[PDB]
Amino acid sequence: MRECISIHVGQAGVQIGNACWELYCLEHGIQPDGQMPDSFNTFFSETGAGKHVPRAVFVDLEPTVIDEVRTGTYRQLFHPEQLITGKEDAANNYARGHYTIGKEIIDLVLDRIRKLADQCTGLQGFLVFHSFGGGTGSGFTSLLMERLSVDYGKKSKLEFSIYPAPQVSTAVVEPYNSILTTHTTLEHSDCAFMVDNEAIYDICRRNLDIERPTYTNLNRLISQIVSSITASLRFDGALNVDLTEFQTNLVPYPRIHFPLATYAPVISAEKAYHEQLSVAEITNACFEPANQMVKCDPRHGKYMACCLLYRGDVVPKDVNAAIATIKTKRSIQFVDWCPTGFKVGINYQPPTVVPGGDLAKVQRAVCMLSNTTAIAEAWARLDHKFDLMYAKRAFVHWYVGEGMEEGEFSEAREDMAALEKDYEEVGVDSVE
Amino acid sequence: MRECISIHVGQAGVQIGNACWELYCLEHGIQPDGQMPDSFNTFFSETGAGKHVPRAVFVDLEPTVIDEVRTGTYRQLFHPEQLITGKEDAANNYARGHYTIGKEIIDLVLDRIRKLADQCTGLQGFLVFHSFGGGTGSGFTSLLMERLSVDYGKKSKLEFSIYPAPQVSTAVVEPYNSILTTHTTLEHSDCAFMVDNEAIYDICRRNLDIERPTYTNLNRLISQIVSSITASLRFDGALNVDLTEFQTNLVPYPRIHFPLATYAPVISAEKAYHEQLSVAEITNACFEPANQMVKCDPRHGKYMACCLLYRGDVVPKDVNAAIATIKTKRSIQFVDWCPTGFKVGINYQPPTVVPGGDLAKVQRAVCMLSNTTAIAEAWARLDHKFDLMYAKRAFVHWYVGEGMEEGEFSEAREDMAALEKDYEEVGVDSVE
Amino acid sequence: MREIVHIQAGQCGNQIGAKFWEVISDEHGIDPTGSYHGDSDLQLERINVYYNEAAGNKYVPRAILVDLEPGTMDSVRSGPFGQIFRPDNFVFGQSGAGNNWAKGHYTEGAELVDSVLDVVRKESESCDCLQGFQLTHSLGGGTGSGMGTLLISKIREEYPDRIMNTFSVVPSPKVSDTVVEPYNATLSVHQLVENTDETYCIDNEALYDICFRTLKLTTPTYGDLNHLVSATMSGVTTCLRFPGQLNADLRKLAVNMVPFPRLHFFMPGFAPLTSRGSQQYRALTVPELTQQMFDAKNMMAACDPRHGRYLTVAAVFRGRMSMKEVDEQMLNVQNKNSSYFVEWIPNNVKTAVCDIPPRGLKMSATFIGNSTAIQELFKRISEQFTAMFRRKAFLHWYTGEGMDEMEFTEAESNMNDLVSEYQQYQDAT
Amino acid sequence: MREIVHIQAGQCGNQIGAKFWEVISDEHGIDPTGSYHGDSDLQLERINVYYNEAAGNKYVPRAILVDLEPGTMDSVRSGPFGQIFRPDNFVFGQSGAGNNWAKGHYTEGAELVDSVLDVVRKESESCDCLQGFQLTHSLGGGTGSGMGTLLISKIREEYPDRIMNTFSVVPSPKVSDTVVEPYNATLSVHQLVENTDETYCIDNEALYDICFRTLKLTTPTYGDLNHLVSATMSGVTTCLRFPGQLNADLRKLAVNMVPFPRLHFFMPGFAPLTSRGSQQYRALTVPELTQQMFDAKNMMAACDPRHGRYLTVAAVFRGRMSMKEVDEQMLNVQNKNSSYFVEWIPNNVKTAVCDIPPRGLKMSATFIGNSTAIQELFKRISEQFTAMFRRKAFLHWYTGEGMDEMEFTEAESNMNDLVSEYQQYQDAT
Amino acid sequence: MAVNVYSTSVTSENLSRHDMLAWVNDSLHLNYTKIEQLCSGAAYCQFMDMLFPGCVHLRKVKFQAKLEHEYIHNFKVLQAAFKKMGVDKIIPVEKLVKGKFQDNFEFIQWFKKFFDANYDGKDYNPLLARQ
Numbered sequence A, B: 001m002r003e004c005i006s007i008h009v010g011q012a013g014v015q016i017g018n019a020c021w022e023l024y025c026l027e028h029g030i031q032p033d034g035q036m037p038d039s040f041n042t043f044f045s046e047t048g049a050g051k052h053v054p055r056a057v058f059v060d061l062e063p064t065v066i067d068e069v070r071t072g073t074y075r076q077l078f079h080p081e082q083l084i085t086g087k088e089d090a091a092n093n094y095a096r097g098h099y100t101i102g103k104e105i106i107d108l109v110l111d112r113i114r115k116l117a118d119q120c121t122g123l124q125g126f127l128v129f130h131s132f133g134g135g136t137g138s139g140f141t142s143l144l145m146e147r148l149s150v151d152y153g154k155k156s157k158l159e160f161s162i163y164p165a166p167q168v169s170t171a172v173v174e175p176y177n178s179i180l181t182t183h184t185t186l187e188h189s190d191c192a193f194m195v196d197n198e199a200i201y202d203i204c205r206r207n208l209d210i211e212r213p214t215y216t217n218l219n220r221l222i223s224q225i226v227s228s229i230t231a232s233l234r235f236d237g238a239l240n241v242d243l244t245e246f247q248t249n250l251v252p253y254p255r256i257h258f259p260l261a262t263y264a265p266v267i268s269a270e271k272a273y274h275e276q277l278s279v280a281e282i283t284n285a286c287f288e289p290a291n292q293m294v295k296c297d298p299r300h301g302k303y304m305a306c307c308l309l310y311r312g313d314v315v316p317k318d319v320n321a322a323i324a325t326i327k328t329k330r331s332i333q334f335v336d337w338c339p340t341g342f343k344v345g346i347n348y349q350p351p352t353v354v355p356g357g358d359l360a361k362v363q364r365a366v367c368m369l370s371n372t373t374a375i376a377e378a379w380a381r382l383d384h385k386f387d388l389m390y391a392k393r394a395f396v397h398w399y400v401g402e403g404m405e406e407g408e409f410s411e412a413r414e415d416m417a418a419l420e421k422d423y424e425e426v427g428v429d430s431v432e
Numbered sequence C, D: 001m002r003e004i005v006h007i008q009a010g011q012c013g014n015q016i017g018a019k020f021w022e023v024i025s026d027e028h029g030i031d032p033t034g035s036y037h038g039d040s041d042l043q044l045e046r047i048n049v050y051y052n053e054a055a056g057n058k059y060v061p062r063a064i065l066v067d068l069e070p071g072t073m074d075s076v077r078s079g080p081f082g083q084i085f086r087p088d089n090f091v092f093g094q095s096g097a098g099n100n101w102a103k104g105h106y107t108e109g110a111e112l113v114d115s116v117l118d119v120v121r122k123e124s125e126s127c128d129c130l131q132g133f134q135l136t137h138s139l140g141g142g143t144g145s146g147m148g149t150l151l152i153s154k155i156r157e158e159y160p161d162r163i164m165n166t167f168s169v170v171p172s173p174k175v176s177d178t179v180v181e182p183y184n185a186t187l188s189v190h191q192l193v194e195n196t197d198e199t200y201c202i203d204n205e206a207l208y209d210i211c212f213r214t215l216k217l218t219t220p221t222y223g224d225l226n227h228l229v230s231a232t233m234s235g236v237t238t239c240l241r242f243p244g245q246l247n248a249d250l251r252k253l254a255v256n257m258v259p260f261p262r263l264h265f266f267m268p269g270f271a272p273l274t275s276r277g278s279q280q281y282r283a284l285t286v287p288e289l290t291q292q293m294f295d296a297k298n299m300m301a302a303c304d305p306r307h308g309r310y311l312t313v314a315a316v317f318r319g320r321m322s323m324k325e326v327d328e329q330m331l332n333v334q335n336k337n338s339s340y341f342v343e344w345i346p347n348n349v350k351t352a353v354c355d356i357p358p359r360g361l362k363m364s365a366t367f368i369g370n371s372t373a374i375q376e377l378f379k380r381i382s383e384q385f386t387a388m389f390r391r392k393a394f395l396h397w398y399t400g401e402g403m404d405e406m407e408f409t410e411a412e413s414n415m416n417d418l419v420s421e422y423q424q425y426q427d428a429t
Numbered sequence E: 001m002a003v004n005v006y007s008t009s010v011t012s013e014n015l016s017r018h019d020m021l022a023w024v025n026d027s028l029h030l031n032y033t034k035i036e037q038l039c040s041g042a043a044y045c046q047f048m049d050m051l052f053p054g055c056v057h058l059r060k061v062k063f064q065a066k067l068e069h070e071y072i073h074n075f076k077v078l079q080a081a082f083k084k085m086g087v088d089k090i091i092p093v094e095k096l097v098k099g100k101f102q103d104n105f106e107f108i109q110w111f112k113k114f115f116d117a118n119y120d121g122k123d124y125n126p127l128l129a130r131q
């Protein structure tokens, strides 16, 4: 009934999608061929036979990444029409994604979304996976969101976004792409979950004892967070939360819609024993800064909203107790305009474990979604990066060559300045 | 309920720890894998399964000694996070331990202590094992104690310390390390139990008929003393004493917190028969100077407090009788400001014997903790040793090279002078 | 003969409701199929208070289940006793309320309300003499709070001469279950003050405390908490459903407990609570029960009765017991604790006794206290509301649904006035 | 009818307490489960003096168990008769007192005291007519001494018209069980002098002597010692719990034994004590018992009655015996030992006789002596206190808990004054 | 800049309960009779203001707090001030707010040492600060 449609944009979005849909299949007992020998149904539609099909669209402007899906283990899982590819990529250029190349497939993508949505009886909304840095993840995603907003007025849209690192980048033009896409998508997105590759790598190294974590590992970790967020819809629970509640709880002001995700416990097989892993223990782990998935310092910021999503063998009283003690602690400060900081969800289903996965099997897990004024720091950094390059007009010729105007750059930058200012204003405590 | 957290610092601390935890496991029937087919619980936390984990932290600045634990018989007993190692040792330099090398892991060590302490419901306090002579045992331990004192205001802290011998040393800079660490730790420790390798060796040779006692033997002996001290918490008893009582009883003045431990009977298999080993007999053995574990002469000093901890098949009346007769004897003199000299504990559990151990199985044992003005002699000796070297500034360049200031040496020395003076003052009897 | 209509709104409302039905069914000897398997004529005498008799000798709860989302409903249906309910009495939306009072009261709830009302009217018409209504819900969410209040408004308009009772789960003091709960509570209270005849305030914090401290349950489940609430609920209608020595009912209790129309917010209590081990070491007698009733640790609202005065107390006893003894106990509490009882309402303890005890127990008691201490709860909510509203935090979620600042302001002011009123009577001589 | 509340503080207090309960239970025909399995109406007649009757025909000690550490409590629970106690009457801390009177009286004890008081009040309210309280503890430790005294203070304030009795284990003369015991004893005595109505002084040294010399026990256990104490305790309430020829009770004994308020420190004795072999070679008759009672070796306090004078003696006999004989014996001891009895209190022997003897014996006797010789004990403590205090030894352990020198000084002075008072009356004509 | 202090084992460096309470009364011009009344946190907040001008938002402090959560709120304000000044001692908030004597006495003894380390002799009228 309560359907959720998943959209995977560009390389990051697609590869994360692969990891998500692998996990979903294991959780619902769906084979890679779509067969199983009302729960799954929010994510999978059903044909006449026992075949089940993901309520998903995978889009990329080049064929390579999706071609892997086509030839891979889950080739029979997806319908061919839900795997959409162009010929040439956006070449790390927002302009190409948003305009030159993106305008050729946007209609197609939207048409397929419309067909998907037509077979939903109680569409809850959209889960959009992409990156900030790529030309497709930035430019195409922005375009897509805009169209979605118009075609579907008020339905929950949630973006899981690969936010670029402070000092661990791949592309050179990343800051440009990040800034423009944030500007263009801002008024069209309800809530966007930032996650950083650096942080996840650190977690893998420090908590899981992995010398060299691969992108796969990161993807797997991300899939856990997503599963926590959607478990309330895919399973039964004691105390439940849906997609339209998160936006209400986590977003205090329209522009300030960037919470951050943190998962606990992430442990190895040998380290999983030796320690009982209580609600108190995992909750504490959540609010410790080293286990966060964005390279930022909450100790230097303030909390505006916390949402805690518990899963498995969990007792409400215990959760209450845990939260109370965390409320006391000096390292957790909340803004003065927010006496109530917590929304709490508890679901009965333990986190399910992928065969050959890095994580140990636990009785309990928790996913925290927290909105923090500390994110301002990252924005400030990104703006500074933009400034350095733009002052010299470095790379600008490319963007203009693809039909973008220089004035739009300045526009994006000023909007981000305003956003920065808005966070700071929010930060300050009430007089009288 | 009444948890006790054990910290093992440097080579001595770690190796003694190995011997202690071996004994604890045998006493509670815990296998080297943590399995057993409310008593143990003060020393071992319990996971969901039947696995039990020591409430302990092992720390050393080099990996070698802890690596033995990792690869050894009790590898599965400890959680990896409770075995902490750096890369480079303190090189018999207090400065490196306290500052240069120690400041890199102190935060880590404390964090793990905090996590351990969080899972305690009735934390009694800390048992700290180290040496006076090593750079880690001296410098790191001092640092650690300071942090503990701040983080945990008023909880019992007890130090079992390998006090250096009069004429049987290993390191050349031992006196420096001993003096500085005593100065720095003095105001942060509640009670510190000195024990000397020379004395234990003598005991092994004389009482156990061992030609060549090894460090292992010494460690085993030490483990007995520790077991006596903690048996009142780990077992049921007739008349019981806890960690917070010892400090009250044995410490008459804040600075004068150095009692000494003596154990009886220490006998071999063949010598264990032929003699019934009564309470009177073992009590007498305790107060005879040859069985003491510090190379010092109580006959030339005065007793300020005795604590007698009996264990096994023991009868209170008998103990009372034994003590009364010892009170009479000329070789036992007590300070004039102390009409009551004895605190007495009796516990039902006999001393448990390690398979392949040097000690014979006895029905009764006793551990005396006695505070004596005779310890002043040792301090005087150590100060003299410091003086000889410092007058020439021998080795001083090393300490200063690691960031220590020369003024701190003089400061440590003067503090020790004061301590010496304080003992002497205490010694004298009341006028009128 | 005095038929009662039961309504359940939202997740909390429905989960409590189901528990309540499980309790009532056991009490009246009704199985999960609707068939009577009891062993006493007393079990069927007043069966019509809560059950309609259907064809082929089965009984169906006079219960309406309402939610803007279909998951809780499904769970209930799949639960033990889920099959006893009338299938057409489940009235559910598809969207949900997003923890938003506005959505429950003005938007999604409003799209569903007419369908509920239709069922309600039918139920009313079924009954020969409609006693009134009991609504179970939370004040902190969107459905139970916003839609529940809407239902209350409409039902009251339709049936102004019948009594409107609510069992309201209130936000706790120390920890907040949701971020917008102050808004949701504040708005709901505004409606409740004008449209309900009596409101039982129940707080999960209190319940957890009771479970841990009194019941000695290391690991309580929500079920346990629900059970307590159900026990209280059953207690209030016991005199209406079985014979007694001095028979009370819903109207009488309201009359006794409510000296002024706005002051209709109670704090319920239940006795006797005991552990598994500790039960044999005591004796369950009237005085013991009374003492258990009159303390702070046994109140299901997170407020200390010692911080205010009792305006009135209703005590309802179930079991074979001596009325004299009860009266003596009641007098005794008044005399000894004189300072905790308002002096201008003499003999402000009302007693009821019903001969049928609950199952497993030989005697029990239910306490209804109308204390001026409840003002603390309201005050806290007002404070929390203010702190958020002064910075207009989350306001666009509500304004987006057509709501205006003025409505919020009026609601706040009304709440403040209520607090003032309560304060007034505690100090009055 | 004259109900007594029992309190146990610390390790010693609890271990004696348990033993006492084992004695009382056997006497009244109560098993470890709380069920009556006796064979006489006399066993149940006055059962309410020490037991509350719970549901389903079981009996529960009116006993409160208090300690700052949980080990002794656990042991008691696991002991034979441990299951008879009310689970909620065990009130324990987690920390312990570190043998420190300060911790027991001002710090840890103070954190726990309110919880104890709550239980105490409830127990008091249970009883139709509260006779008073008996507290068992040591003076040498931290809990029994510091917390015990605190309890005494508070209870007395609450219930100033009920009698406060203590069974105090005093530090021995020759050997000290702990190093700070003089401080702990001295402080405790300060409280006891002002707040208790009667205090039974018991010393382990005396008990051991009795075990070795009189009972011929080569290897006594603490249990044996405890048994003696329990026998004495039971002796003092025997006339209140069974019928007799001349019935005494706690009030009467206090009245007879206490001529001045401060002089309420007794030395108890029990008769008859015999070995296994030596029992058959004697005859247990009234004169024999009397002679056993009146000697130094049978006093449970380490002081020689021949070093002072008896102010008063209470003698309580249990069994079927001729009152004339008893009276003759009493007269005889006074006449022959004239110099050991103060001359300005004529006929200073008080006699009670209870018809029910203890189990296993056909007759027995309990002696309560108020002797000026007890001043020796106090004097010793004062000396020991002074020797330590003059050098301020261990003082930082107490000052660290907020205590000041002034308090110590005042305590010392008070103790000294008491000694002086006792001295005065021994020499008075 | 604010220094840090530790309390474990000392002699002749401990005020009696009476003396310490007198000091609090004189310093803040209030009339506490039990050390546990300091568990509300208002007094500690005021002391911080007196020590370090600025520092605490006193308009947020509840001087007549009677409920546990109100006390918690005051201690959050205190915690923030400690963070601002770089005092690294962890305040055991959960134990203090229960109003337990032992913990409160421990905290006041630390706070007194901290105050003495840092007090510059300034005079101020605390009534204005209060209201």
Ligand SMILES: Nc1nc2c(ncn2[C@@H]2O[C@H](COP(=O)(O)OP(=O)(O)OP(=O)(O)O)[C@@H](O)[C@H]2O)c(=O)[nH]1
Pocket: A009, A010, A011, A012, A013, A015, A016, A061, A089, A090, A091, A092, A093, A131, A133, A134, A135, A136, A137, A138, A162, A164, A170, A171, A197, A215, A216, A218, A219
């Ligand atoms: N977590 C994660 N991040 C990825 C993965 N693949 C790429 N990224 C990140 O995504 C960003 C690069 O964007 P891509 O998604 O590869 O580029 P694109 O969206 O395909 O855009 P074009 O290739 O330019 O059309 C960088 O920050 C990468 O670190 C992945 O599998 N997992």
Ligand SMILES: Nc1nc2c(ncn2[C@@H]2O[C@H](COP(=O)(O)OP(=O)(O)OP(=O)(O)O)[C@@H](O)[C@H]2O)c(=O)[nH]1
Pocket: B009, B010, B011, B012, B013, B015, B016, B061, B089, B090, B091, B092, B093, B131, B133, B134, B135, B136, B137, B138, B162, B164, B170, B171, B197, B215, B216, B218, B219
């Ligand atoms: N009793 C006993 N003493 C030991 C043992 N090992 C070392 N010692 C003593 O400890 C002192 C040497 O200090 P160590 O503990 O080896 O040095 P450390 O603490 O590791 O410091 P660094 O190696 O300089 O970092 C000497 O007095 C040794 O005799 C042991 O197993 N048992």
Ligand SMILES: [Mg+2]
Pocket: A010, A011, A062, A089, A134, A136
């Ligand atoms: Mg790409």
Ligand SMILES: [Mg+2]
Pocket: B010, B011, B062, B089, B134, B136
């Ligand atoms: Mg080393």
